[PDB]
């Protein structure tokens, strides 16, 4: 049994990363396309053998309610458009996969969660790293007690962003700067590595406003998290340096991945008992993208809850709001 | 020619690490021993061929003023005793090498500086990493513009401390916890890699007071620094995990060392326009310990000021005070 996906927003992540990976899916198939660009419907429709009956514009999208080949809508638009397409998908009676960050604000996440709940449909956020072999290995090491209690997480995510005119540097479409786009991986990892939610937040923001990229959104915003167990996190989010990594440490040792949350190329190093050494993780049957896709399908087929549901996206937005507030007010913000 | 060192406080660092390294010095020699333990004066006096006339207790130390073979007193005691022994050394007409952290407080550092200035004698703090090959290479890459402007420094220093009865876990003798002893390397590195002084500080402290080690001083205190240029640092200081590293990053690339400030075994990786790769630093004429010792001797001989003088130690203590305050008050502290 395979559930049918409609892919909505045929941009870089949809066409270059996600759509090719239906190949290794065992419980998901590409069923429909939704796009604001008629040429893309034709190009990708022909490539993937999607009939015109299964190609929608953003104006005809609501008609997808009458397409029984579509079980799931995967929303892969700019951040500010996640909420309205998710709500429309839910009203069309479809389950929803929504890319990160979930939405601009906590309230927008709550609205999305309520719409899917009202429709009796499942909602999952695209945190692919939870299906990635090295990340799973680090989480399991922590959970198995290999490190002892988690004491620190140090994690940095950033890339040197380019074209000033792209939607990620436009507040109306992006909802914020590096933190919304790439810093969220630092936050999400801090949460899944500790298995906790933070109770206190510090942040420092640093942005050169004379740079043509950064008239509207932030470049650097680094933050600290305190958790109820006493665990701490130091996190970098940046649009002007390249980094992608984390190290989680306890009294018995530590494990790091660098790059940690990239599309490929992960490398893990651990210091457990002896000197630091590379560690190979248990391989996963499917790559992280196909695994993510199949996870939602499998949840729907067996009536289970996604491990990264709407609530996970919302928990991230709650901390993101506090991070921005902490930097603005120059104080420790309590959650 | 060579200047004579008196080594004061014959503990682990003095006897296991520093005193063997006079072998490779070119302008420094071991001339005297000062100790509160008669047996050690005998042991090390015999081992190193130091005559009984050049052996002092803490009671007779002031008599060293009459010993012309002694040019420099190297103070290697618990932190709270740095100030009184430094002042006595200066009043005994000797130049002073003082171990880190310089002293417990800003006021104590200022007092040591005034004492040496009054005596017309030089004061240097034992920041050996400034003479270590990998660290010098990292500073050079920054100053040569290899990375572009520094945007982030991410640095972690900690070790799993043992015996609860040792002076480092005793506030009266240590002056504070992990930040005083090991976290200061994170701070000092942030400062010499940016080449700036911070203008704002955040901090988070986390200590299990039911742990036998931590009745008096702090375990983890992580901090954030903002610099005038816009550069940022995220720093870990810990007594319950092992870490020793830093990475400095700009828009053109990054360089990291791990272990960074250890006695030996430094390894460097850099990302400069290509994928991350190991990098070997330019070699140094001698090891960081002998280089540190000769640096002070050479400064005295040529009249120059040490690159890590008393003001460097003071600058660290100023930020350390702000780190503890930021943690205590839960706010961004301005400097
Ligand atoms: N999990 C991951 O690893 C990744 C997640 N993402 C997430 O995916 C989403 C899209 O990112 P990416 O695919 O990189 O962005 P792109 O700009 O490459 O694609 C965005 C697409 O969204 C559609 N769209 C609808 N309205 C607009 C609008 N007003 N302005 C621009 N585009 C619009 C367009 O598709 P059409 O022409 O079909 O309308 C456009 O091509 C974001 O939420 C991002 O965070 C991105 C990359 C990786
Ligand atoms: N730069 C570096 O890499 C390092 C720097 N250090 C610094 O060196 C100093 C000493 O550290 P370490 O050598 O590890 O500590 P140790 O405890 O091993 O040596 C301390 C010595 O100081 C003397 N001393 C004087 N008064 C006291 C006292 N009241 N209680 C205890 N000892 C006393 C004793 O020597 P005696 O018996 O001769 O009186 C004792 O052996 C500290 O400031 C530390 O921060 C330490 C390690 C490495
Ligand atoms: O070392 C990890 C990788 O670093 C580089 O990847 C960059 C991308 O070039 C850049 O587009 C950006 O992609 C992220 C995207 O903006 C975000 O929406 C999404 O959720 O995550 C994407 C992937 O992280 O940032 C990454 C930095 O990780 C480099 O191009 C790549 O080869 C390296 O593997
Ligand atoms: O990976 C780096 C090293 O980690 C371990 O070294 C520990 C020491 O065992 C511990 O004593 C402590 O030494 C520091 C000391 O407390 C402080 O006063 C001084 O200024 O710095 C000393 C050296 O850093 O912390 C270090 C951690 O750096 C490990 O034992 C060693 O093999 C590793 O090389």
Asked, as a colleague might, if the bond just before A8 is cis with ω within 30 of 0, I would say no
Question: CA-CA distance, A272 to A140, in Å (whole number)?
Answer: 14
Chain centroid, CA B39 distance in Å: 28
Rg (CA), chain A: 20
DSSP states along B51-82: -GGGEE-TTTGGGGGG-TT--EEEE-S-GGGH
Q: Annotated catalytic, B48?
A: no
Partner A contacted by B249 (CB < 8 A): yes
Check B152 against A236: CB less than 8 A apart.
yes
Question: CA-CA distance, A33 to B117, in Å (whole number)?
Answer: 77
Min CA distance, B119 vs chain A (Å)? 43
Report chain A residues whose CB lies below 8 A from the CB of B154. 154, 156, 234, 236, 243
End-to-end CA distance of chain B: 43
Question: CA-CA distance, A182 to B192, in Å (whole number)?
Answer: 28
DSSP states along B187-252: HHHHHHHHTS--SEEEEEEE--TTSTT-SSS-SEEEEEEE-TTS-EEEEEEESSS-EEEEEEEETT
Q: Annotated catalytic, A58?
A: no
CA dihedral for A203, A209, A215, A219, sign (positive or negative): negative
**Three-class secondary structure assignment of A76-111:** CCCHHHHHHHHHHHHHCCCEEEECCCCCCCHHHHHH
Check residue A178 and report its DSSP letter: H
Q: What b/e sequence results for A113-123 when a residue is b if at least 16 CB atoms lie within 10 Å of its CB, and e otherwise?
A: bebbeebebbb
Q: Which region holds residue B195: left if phi is over 0, alpha if psi is between -120 and 50, else beta?
A: left
The upper half-sphere exposure of residue A60, i.e. CA atoms within 13 Å in the direction of its Cβ, equals 16
Q: Which among A17, A224, A91 has a CA at the least distance from the CA of B330?
A: A224
Answer whether B231's CB lies under 8 Å from B244's CB: no
Partner A contacted by B200 (CB < 8 A): yes
Q: For B276-285, which contacts have Cβ atoms below 8 Å and span 24 or more sequence positions?
A: B276/A258, B279/B137, B279/B255, B281/B133, B281/B134, B281/B136, B281/B137, B281/B138, B282/B133, B282/B136, B282/B137, B282/B140, B283/B133, B284/B131, B284/B132, B284/B133, B284/B136
* Secondary structure (3-state) at A203: strand
Asked, as a colleague might, if the bond just before A101 is cis with ω within 30 of 0, I would say yes
Question: CA-CA distance, B22 to B57, in Å (whole number)?
Answer: 22
Please state how this structure was obtained: X-ray
Write the CB contacts of B35 (distance below 8 Å, at least 6 apart in sequence): B8, B9, B10, B41, B44, B55, B56, B57, B58
Instruction: Supply A6's token pair.
Output: 């409609």
Partner A contacted by B151 (CB < 8 A): yes
Question: What is each CA distance from B299 to A127, A138, B55, B113, B126, in whole angstroms?
Answer: 57, 50, 26, 17, 14
Partner B contacted by A251 (CB < 8 A): yes
Give ligand 1 pocket residues (Cβ under 6 A). A 9-14, 35-37, 40, 76-79, 81, 99-100, 126, 128, 167, 173, 181
Chain centroid, CA B221 distance in Å: 18
Q: How many CB atoms lie within 10 A of CB A156?
A: 29
How buried is A177 (Cβ within 10 angstroms: 0-12 exposed, 13-18 middle, 19+ buried)? buried
Backbone angles phi, psi at A96, to 5 degrees: -135, 130
Report chain A residues whose CB lies below 8 A from the CB of B203. 202, 224
- Sheet containing strand B123-125, edge to edge, reads B55-56, B28-34, B3-8, B72-75, B95-98, B123-125
Closest C-alpha to ligand 3, atom 24: A262
* Secondary structure (3-state) at A125: strand
How buried is A280 (Cβ within 10 angstroms: 0-12 exposed, 13-18 middle, 19+ buried)? exposed
Cite the beta strand spans of A227-332 per DSSP E: 232-238, 243-250, 253-257, 268-272, 277-279
Check A250 against B241: CB less than 8 A apart.
yes
CA dihedral for B114, B118, B119, B123, sign (positive or negative): positive
How buried is A216 (Cβ within 10 angstroms: 0-12 exposed, 13-18 middle, 19+ buried)? middle
Question: What is each CA distance from B284 to B133, B135, B226, B287, B288, in whole angstroms?
Answer: 6, 11, 32, 7, 9
Asked, as a colleague might, if the bond just before A259 is cis with ω within 30 of 0, I would say yes
Q: Is any ligand 3 atom within 6 A of the Cβ of residue A244?
A: yes
Chain centroid, CA A140 distance in Å: 20
Chain centroid, CA A333 distance in Å: 24
Tokens 């205190």 locate to B221
Closest C-alpha to ligand 2, atom 24: B77
Write the CB contacts of B245 (distance below 8 Å, at least 6 apart in sequence): B155, B156, B157, B256, B257, B258, B259, B260
Listed by number, the residues of chain A in 254-293 with a beta carbon closer than 8 Å to a beta carbon of chain B are 254, 258, 271
Tokens 């240590």 locate to B174
Torsion of CA A167, A171, A172, A174, to 10 degrees: 50
β pairing state of A232-238 and A152-158? parallel
Instruction: Supply A201's token pair.
Output: 């937040």
Backbone angles phi, psi at A51, to 5 degrees: -65, 155
Instruction: Supply B34's token pair.
Output: 């000062």
Q: Which among B38, B33, B45, B42 has a CA at the least distance from the CA of B9?
A: B33
Which atom of ligand 3 is found nearest the CA of A100?
20
Answer whether B129's CB lies under 8 Å from B261's CB: yes
Q: How many angstroms does the Cα of residue B262 sit away from the middle of ligand 4?
A: 6
Pick from B132, B159, B263 the residue to mutate for probing ligand 4's pocket: most ligand atoms within 8 Å of its CB.
Answer: B159
Q: Is any ligand 2 atom within 6 A of the Cβ of residue B159?
A: no
Instruction: Supply A323's token pair.
Output: 């991070």
Residue of B nearest to A273 (CA): B242
Instruction: Supply A148's token pair.
Output: 């002892």
Answer whether B100's CB lies under 8 Å from B109's CB: no
Write the CB contacts of B166 (distance below 8 Å, at least 6 apart in sequence): none
Question: CA-CA distance, B181 to B94, in Å (whole number)?
Answer: 26
For each of the domains in chain A, give its residue range(s) and CATH number, in order of start.
1-131+279-309 (3.40.50.720), 132-278+310-335 (3.30.360.10)
Q: How many CB atoms lie within 10 A of CB B171?
A: 16
Check B204 against A230: CB less than 8 A apart.
no
Question: CA-CA distance, A205 to B229, in Å (whole number)?
Answer: 13
Closest C-alpha to ligand 1, atom 16: A11
- Sheet containing strand B232-238, edge to edge, reads B277-278, B268-271, B253-257, B243-250, B152-158, B232-238, B220-226, B200-206, B333-334
Report chain B residues whose CB lies below 8 A from the CB of A240. 151, 250-251
Resolution in A: 1.9
Q: Which ligand is nearest to the CA of A78?
A: 1
Answer whether A150's CB lies under 8 Å from A193's CB: yes
β pairing state of B232-238 and B152-158? parallel
How buried is A186 (Cβ within 10 angstroms: 0-12 exposed, 13-18 middle, 19+ buried)? buried
Partner A contacted by B152 (CB < 8 A): yes
Q: What b/e sequence results for B294-303 when a residue is b if at least 16 CB atoms lie within 10 Å of its CB, and e otherwise?
A: bbbbbbbeee
DSSP states along B86-146: HHHHHHTT-EEEEPSS--SSHHHHHHHHHHHHHHT--EEE--GGGGSHHHHHHHHHHHTTT
Q: Nearest CB to A249: which of B204, B241, B276?
A: B241
Write the CB contacts of B329 (distance below 8 Å, at least 6 apart in sequence): none
Partner A contacted by B224 (CB < 8 A): yes
Residue of B nearest to A247 (CA): B243
Residue of B nearest to A207 (CA): B230
DSSP states along B138-153: HHHHHHTTTTSS--EE
Q: Which ligand is nearest to the CA of B79?
A: 2
Question: CA-CA distance, B173 to B168, in Å (whole number)?
Answer: 7
Question: What is each CA distance from B2 to A228, B30, B50, B289, in whole angstroms?
Answer: 57, 10, 16, 16
Closest C-alpha to ligand 3, atom 3: A262
- Check B5, B56, B127, B185 and give the catalytic one: B185
Min CA distance, A314 vs chain B (Å)? 25
Q: Which region holds residue B279: left if phi is over 0, alpha if psi is between -120 and 50, else beta?
A: beta
Backbone angles phi, psi at B252, to 5 degrees: -100, -10
Q: Which residues pair with A200 in a beta bridge?
A: A226, A334
- Check A185, A192, A239, A324 and give the catalytic one: A185
Answer whether B90's CB lies under 8 Å from B116's CB: yes
How buried is A57 (Cβ within 10 angstroms: 0-12 exposed, 13-18 middle, 19+ buried)? middle
Instruction: Supply B46's token pair.
Output: 């015999």
Instruction: Supply B136's token pair.
Output: 């010098």
Question: What is each CA distance from A151 to A30, A241, B233, in whole angstroms?
Answer: 43, 26, 19
Q: Is any ligand 2 atom within 6 A of the Cβ of residue B182?
A: no
Question: CA-CA distance, B76 to B89, in Å (whole number)?
Answer: 13
CA dihedral for A2, A48, A263, A318, sign (positive or negative): negative
């Amino acid at each position: 049994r395979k559930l049918g996906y409609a892919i909505l927003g045929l941009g870089y992540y949809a066409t270059r990363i996600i759509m090719p990976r239906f190949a290794e899916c065992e419980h998901s198939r590409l069923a429909a396309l939704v796009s604001g660009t008629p040429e893309k419907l034709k190009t990708y429709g022909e490539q993937y053998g999607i009939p015109e009956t299964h190609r929608y514009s953003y104006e005809t999208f609501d008609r997808i309610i009458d397409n029984p080949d579509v079980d799931i809508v995967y929303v892969i638009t700019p951040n500010s458009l996640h909420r309205p397409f998710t709500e429309r998908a839910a009203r069309a009676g479809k389950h929803v996969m929504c890319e990160k960050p979930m939405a601009n604000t906590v309230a927008d996440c709550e609205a999305m969660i309520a719409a899917c709940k009202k429709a009796g449909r499942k909602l999952m956020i695209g945190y692919r790293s939870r299906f990635q072999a090295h990340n799973i290995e680090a989480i399991k090491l922590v959970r198995d007690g290999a490190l002892g209690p988690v004491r620190t997480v140090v994690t940095d995510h950033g890339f040197t962003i380019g074209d000033p005119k792209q939607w990620r540097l436009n507040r109306a479409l992006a909802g914020g700067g590096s933190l919304m786009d790439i810093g969220i991986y630092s936050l999400n990892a801090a949460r899944y590595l500790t298995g906790e939610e933070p109770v206190a937040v510090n942040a420092v923001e640093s942005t050169d406003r004379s740079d043509p990229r950064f008239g509207e959104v932030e470049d650097i915003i680094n933050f600290q998290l305190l958790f109820p167990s006493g665990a701490t996190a130091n996190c970098v989010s940046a649009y002007s340096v390249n980094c992608n990594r984390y190290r989680v440490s306890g009294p018995k040792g530590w494990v790091e991945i660098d790059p940690a949350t990239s599309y490929q190329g992960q490398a893990m190093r651990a210091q457990l008992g002896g000197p630091p050494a590379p560690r190979e993780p248990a391989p996963q049957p499917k790559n992280q993208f196909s695994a993510q896709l199949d996870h939602l399908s499998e949840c729907i087929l067996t009536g289970r809850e996604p491990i990264v549901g709407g609530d996970d996206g919302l928990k991230d937005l709650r901390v993101i709001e506090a991070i921005y507030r902490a930097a603005r007010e120059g104080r420790t913000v309590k959650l």
